[PDB]
Symmetry: C3
Subunit: 286 residues, 3 copies
């Protein structure tokens, strides 16, 4: 197998965007789940549907793939993805992560990634926000790693390290912002495990993931982080705990998408505020 994209392809997509907007972003934000509305806070906003952009992964109905929104968020020149690609949809990881390498060639230096996740840590509660300190890449252990294939030194090394993936400094700076918001619940912090999905975990599977030392489980993010780190980006991310994974056989409740989207809706304002203030804490370049 190999990444279907040549270096020329990524460059071509970046050149195209560079020619169609005067915006020059520094921060890329992948808006996870129930956080799409964050583009409503950008100023000077210029929207591009993924369907218009050369080389972007395609959805059957071209528009449901989503859009890149360039603008300014609380001082920072941003590009936000509203709509992301998941491997459970059938995309190979070199398509899932194609935009990350584009952001880099646009001059982005920081990637913020967010998602919704199921809570594995028994102390977490629906609505909780968990900052991501580390991840467990289960698909990557098996060969599903976005860097599989010939390496291009123009982006990075053959064997990049991931032990420092999540910027220590901005997890610190985010603990600050949280007190400034004056919040009842404390800001959670922990390990995110990626599983492919799309079906939800069984009880026995949830117990496995808890014993691996994971705090939250979702179906995305890890690959983007790996590709970000590989090309030099600073990374910060968090998960909204939208549900507490079922851990025992007596329970008569089940994980469901409606309940995940509901939690998304509730935590919407909190999240957009949270991310907007944090922009000020991202270092300026140079």
């Amino acid at each position: 197998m190999e990444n279907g994209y040549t270096y020329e392809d990524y460059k071509n997509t970046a050149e195209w965007l560079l020619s169609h907007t005067k915006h020059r972003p520094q921060v890329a934000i992948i808006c996870g789940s129930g956080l799409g509305g964050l583009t409503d806070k950008l100023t000077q906003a210029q929207i591009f549907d993924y369907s218009e952009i050369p080389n972007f992964p395609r959805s059957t109905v071209p528009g449901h793939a989503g859009r890149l929104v360039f603008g300014f968020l609380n001082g920072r020149a941003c590009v936000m993805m509203q709509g992301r690609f998941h491997m459970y949809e059938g995309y190979p990881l070199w398509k899932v992560t194609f935009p990350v390498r584009v952001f880099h060639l646009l001059g982005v230096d920081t990637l913020v990634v967010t998602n919704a996740a199921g809570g594995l840590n028994p102390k977490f509660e629906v609505g909780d926000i968990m900052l991501i300190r580390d991840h467990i890449n289960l698909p990557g252990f098996s060969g599903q790693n976005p860097l599989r294939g010939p390496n291009d030194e123009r982006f990075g090394d053959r064997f990049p390290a991931m032990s420092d993936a999540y910027d220590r400094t901005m997890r610190q700076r985010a603990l600050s912002t949280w007190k400034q918001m004056g919040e009842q619940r404390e800001l959670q912090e922990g390990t995110y495990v990626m599983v492919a999905g799309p079906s939800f975990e069984t009880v026995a599977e949830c117990r496995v993931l808890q014993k691996l030392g994971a705090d939250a489980v979702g179906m995305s993010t890890v690959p983007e982080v790996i590709v970000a780190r590989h090309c030099g980006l600073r990374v910060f991310g968090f998960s909204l705990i939208t549900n507490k994974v079922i851990m025992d056989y007596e329970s008569l409740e089940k994980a469901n998408h409606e309940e995940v989207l509901a939690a998304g809706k509730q935590a919407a304002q909190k999240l957009e505020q949270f991310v907007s203030i944090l922009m000020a804490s991202i270092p300026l370049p140079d």
Copy 2:
């Protein structure tokens, strides 16, 4: 990637079978290992070789794939698969599970799945029968999930839950049937872990699987269950423990297919009886 089968394909296979038999099955039974002989107890039996049926996964020698046998088992209108597809044979999971979606469109409402499995729980003994209370889908954590790809709402939801996969009621009703048979060994119950195989586990691997909380290990079943649950089927299943996985380096014994097939032969009568009586306990439809 995507499922090579369109909704039309599944419908076409179901329409074909519906036109070639007057039998209308309610229960699908996937006969696992050393339980093929169960078709000898059907009455009014009509056999179809997989090679004759449109869209069915193909074996090199078309006949070795197996056959669908329609009939009546102790009162219930059944369709049994004698011969199944495994991912270790090279089939993608959307081929492995193609028949499950066909059963559904035939009007089946219940799936019974059986298999042979290696015992991980140290109390299990060769010959033991373990009812399946839950599973650990290791291939699915990595992306090998039969629902990967665009979802079709005609079968089910994008994100189906699996925590309730194994019908509580019929595990209860099966504990009954077992006492009615008056058996020496108790009916075992536990967690089935799927690994792809086809080679057998090492000692270090067996210890891993034991520590994941698995009781039995095999190379099948999970995907069919996921697809069953996804389209609304009730599911019950069990494993014949054909061997006790080697757990220490001193042992000079090794897992082997001859010994697995032997255990299959011994437990043959016990199994066919067990499943036949249980049919009476499957609710009627409506």
Copy 3:
């Protein structure tokens, strides 16, 4: 999916080599990392670039793939691979392991495999040599097993056992050779876990692998061993611990390829000596 190679292909590659060298090897050595120099100790050495050999997996620049070197090492007729294929490079496992089946048809009866590995056992130290007593095949649990696909009985069984993969006798005989060398550090022994890579593990991932009972982690070897065992070869192998995997968040150190290659260089002489003496301990055939 299926193995792209027919039995004829393997036979054709073996016949070709058999026609182009008078050497008839008994022992195959896959030279892992910083152990390529071992070909400098062969006598009567005949080199074949992988690019010249029919059916050999191909590298973009044909020469960077490596070479087969036939010769005599301390008494034994050997064939050594200098350069190997990894799944993180994009090769399917039936390409990674193609040479193993060729060795067999050349008449090889023993496979020695070596590699560099990250230390998970906290007692190991950089420079340590760990003999491999067992392995955990994480990719294989998910379907990435070199035997996936139709089985060819000419090489072996559908379901080969792996619990006895690493020859008990020569791990014993290697403990000997080590004292004969008069070494300060003791010869380590333990479990090798394969992960696909190519990126390095996170802290949370390292803790997972430690709790699986693994002592060393690398990105190769397991598949070759599985295919070796499947066709009847005796197998012995070891890992050079080139680094101690980062296990806590305070550490400011990171795994890196330079440091791995450095450790390789240091342990070079020790390794070539170690393997050369050991040849005398490999049983003669017949």
